[PDB]
Amino acid sequence: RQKTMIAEARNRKSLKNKAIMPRSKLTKSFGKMEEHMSTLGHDMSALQDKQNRAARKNRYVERGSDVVFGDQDALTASTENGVKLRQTDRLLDGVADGSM
Amino acid sequence: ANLRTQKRLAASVVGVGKRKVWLDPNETSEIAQANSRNAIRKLVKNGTIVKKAVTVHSKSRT
Amino acid sequence: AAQKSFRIKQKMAKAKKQNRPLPQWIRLRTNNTIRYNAKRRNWRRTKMNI
Amino acid sequence: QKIAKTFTVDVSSPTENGVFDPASYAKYLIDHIKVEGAVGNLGNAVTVTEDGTVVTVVSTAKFSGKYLKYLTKKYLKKNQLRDWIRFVSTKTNEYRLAFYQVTPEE
Amino acid sequence: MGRYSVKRYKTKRRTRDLDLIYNDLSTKESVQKLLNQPLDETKPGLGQHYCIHCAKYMETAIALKTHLKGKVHKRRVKELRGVPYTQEVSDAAAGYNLNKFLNRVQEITQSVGPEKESNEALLKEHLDSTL
Amino acid sequence: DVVTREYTINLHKRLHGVSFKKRAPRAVKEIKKFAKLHMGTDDVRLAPELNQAIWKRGVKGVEYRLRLRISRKRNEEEDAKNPLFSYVEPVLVASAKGLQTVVVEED
RNA sequence: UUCAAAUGAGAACUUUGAAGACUGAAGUGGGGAAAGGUUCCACGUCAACAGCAGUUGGACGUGGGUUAGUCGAUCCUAAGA
RNA sequence: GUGAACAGCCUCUAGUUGAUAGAAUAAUGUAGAUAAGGGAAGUCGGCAAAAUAGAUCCGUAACUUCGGGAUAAGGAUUGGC
Ligand SMILES: [Mg+2]
Ligand SMILES: [Mg+2]
Ligand SMILES: [Mg+2]
Ligand SMILES: [Mg+2]
Ligand SMILES: [Mg+2]
Ligand SMILES: [Mg+2]
Ligand SMILES: [Mg+2]
Ligand SMILES: [Mg+2]
Ligand SMILES: [Mg+2]
Ligand SMILES: [Mg+2]
Ligand SMILES: [Zn+2]
């Protein structure tokens, strides 16, 4: 197990070329948390309760924008030169209709 | 997607080199929306963009 | 040069405003024989020589 | 000169989530704190006590919160908790053990 | 194989062997003969200033003195401390002429060794006095 | 047929005599060829952690042996020409010596 | 130089991440003078050009951008005109 | 950091990772190396390479415009603790 831990740490680390990212800035997942704590042999009752509370708190409630605009797009003619509403278009401002 | 502008703006906003800025590869659409330094600052605050630590040059042997 | 003369900058302004392709509606006129800008200039192709 | 310094650590979050032992942490500190270059030399200089939520170190001879953090990170690494639990300062010379940010599974 | 080893230990650039130098130091007559040599034009220092341990001529007495005060000479002195490693050692390690090798070791420890040590002591103190 | 096995690859005899700037890239190509040989899949995908293990000692410092976990799985996309592909992962062990091919149980 | 993902009709060459290297402060870094004149930056976007390629570009199309009592010119005289 | 040192070599900040690619490893090339014994017998000619090289100490001829020649030549040495 000690030799395996050495090998895994060596494959993990690249300190000569760059520093390791800070854990306090990263965020991880409860699935990995649960499997690691289970490997350590702790009881996951409290952590599972916290995760259940978080999952119940993060609810998805739809709104009118979700009903109306959810599968639609556009609602404005796409310009030929990627221009804003009041941006001049030197090339096309003299030709009003799209056929011409 | 092309995030070159966001990478440059993140380096300028955080105050480090472009070599020291981490853009979350999972949040590509959110990062691609951010066209201003204000939106870049918001991404830095919530952690989509991270400042990397310096590469170590130890002096223990010296 | 960064520190330039007003005469130089005025000529540069004229060149910038001249830098364009044809307006499309010119092609639609009766008996139009103008089909492209034959005096278009580019900064890396023909120098203005002041 | 040898004014008594008090350092406190709050272990309540990992203790209540069931992945930490304050008594073992205190025993590790007792056995591993070095005074004048050797372990087991804490005679009337460093006292480590705990009551299940707060671990208190009282020292009069060359102790700092950086050293305390170093020892705590060693203990967490030995228990394979270094990837999940960190040692934070809340106010001066009072510290706590806090989980890193975990996304809910969904 | 490499150029350094080739050009240092080429056969035409060979040096005297350690068992031969051990025999040179073992007897007093050899020591006196090598200490007092005729004026030879083709040796450095006219054949004088000869270190027996290193089998080396020096140009001058001051050169010989600075040589004796050196780690190179002390390395050679350490090398000449033990049994001189004849073919008898290799034969005995193979398990052949064992009694002959053991008799030779006994003779070194009893007679030839201490006489060589006494000659070396006398030679060193003579070099200290004359230098 | 979905399956997962662990193999040892001898990179030493595959990289015997290769130019130093080309050793690790040739190791990548050799492992792809190895997975193709063992699973019949022309679509081979290497884990970036495996690529790290290959490149760990630079361009010319590839290990003599590597322990691989190779999984033949199903291609879910409709646009692909191949219904099967292989995913190669590294197995980080104490030593890659003396290990034989094994079938990993799938759960 | 390599790996995965994304984008895409199409990716050795685009983007992000994962790695391996290099310039090694007399720099492959950070600014200016002469010269250039918009090449700067954003959006759109690949016919031609980038001696392979191209979804990329100092390319093509449409725009945005240079704010001074104190920085310069301007004033002074130099060899000279 | 090494070192006398803006040398060479390695690294931090910052910046690049650009220059058509893939596979094979015949001859002849281009660039770089090693070679038993001999040691210029090669050649118009030692061309080219090799050999020397830092520092400390010992020592240093002719000739001379007395200033030089001179690092003349020739020797001893060098790590680590
Ligand atoms: Mg070969
Ligand atoms: Mg380098
Ligand atoms: Mg270099
Ligand atoms: Mg640009
Ligand atoms: Mg082309
Ligand atoms: Mg343009
Ligand atoms: Mg030869
Ligand atoms: Mg001849
Ligand atoms: Mg001849
Ligand atoms: Mg001379
Ligand atoms: Zn000697």
Short mmCIF file of C-alpha atoms (C1' of nucleotides) in Angstrom, two decimals, chain E residues 1 3 6-7 10-12 56 58-59 62-63 66-67 71-72, chain H residues 34-39 50-51 58 74-80:
data_model
loop_
_atom_site.label_atom_id
_atom_site.label_comp_id
_atom_site.label_asym_id
_atom_site.label_seq_id
_atom_site.Cartn_x
_atom_site.Cartn_y
_atom_site.Cartn_z
CA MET E 1 37.05 2.49 -24.43
CA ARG E 3 39.35 8.56 -24.82
CA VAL E 6 42.64 5.01 -23.52
CA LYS E 7 45.16 7.83 -23.61
CA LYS E 10 47.66 2.96 -23.15
CA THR E 11 50.19 0.12 -22.98
CA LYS E 12 52.98 2.39 -24.24
CA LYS E 56 58.63 8.59 -10.14
CA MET E 58 61.13 14.66 -9.79
CA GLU E 59 63.06 17.52 -11.32
CA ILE E 62 61.63 20.99 -3.62
CA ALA E 63 59.41 19.20 -6.15
CA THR E 66 55.88 19.17 -2.30
CA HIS E 67 55.03 15.76 -3.78
CA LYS E 71 47.16 13.23 -1.33
CA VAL E 72 48.48 11.45 -4.45
"C1'" U H 34 35.06 6.92 -31.26
"C1'" A H 35 39.04 3.62 -32.75
"C1'" A H 36 44.00 -1.81 -31.76
"C1'" G H 37 49.52 -1.28 -33.25
"C1'" G H 38 52.41 2.54 -35.55
"C1'" G H 39 52.99 7.94 -35.20
"C1'" A H 50 44.22 15.95 -31.74
"C1'" A H 51 47.00 17.68 -27.90
"C1'" C H 58 58.12 26.32 -7.28
"C1'" G H 74 59.96 23.45 -17.22
"C1'" G H 75 57.65 21.31 -12.62
"C1'" A H 76 54.07 20.18 -7.88
"C1'" U H 77 48.97 20.32 -7.04
"C1'" U H 78 43.27 20.65 -7.01
"C1'" G H 79 37.10 16.20 -4.23
"C1'" G H 80 34.49 15.32 0.32
#
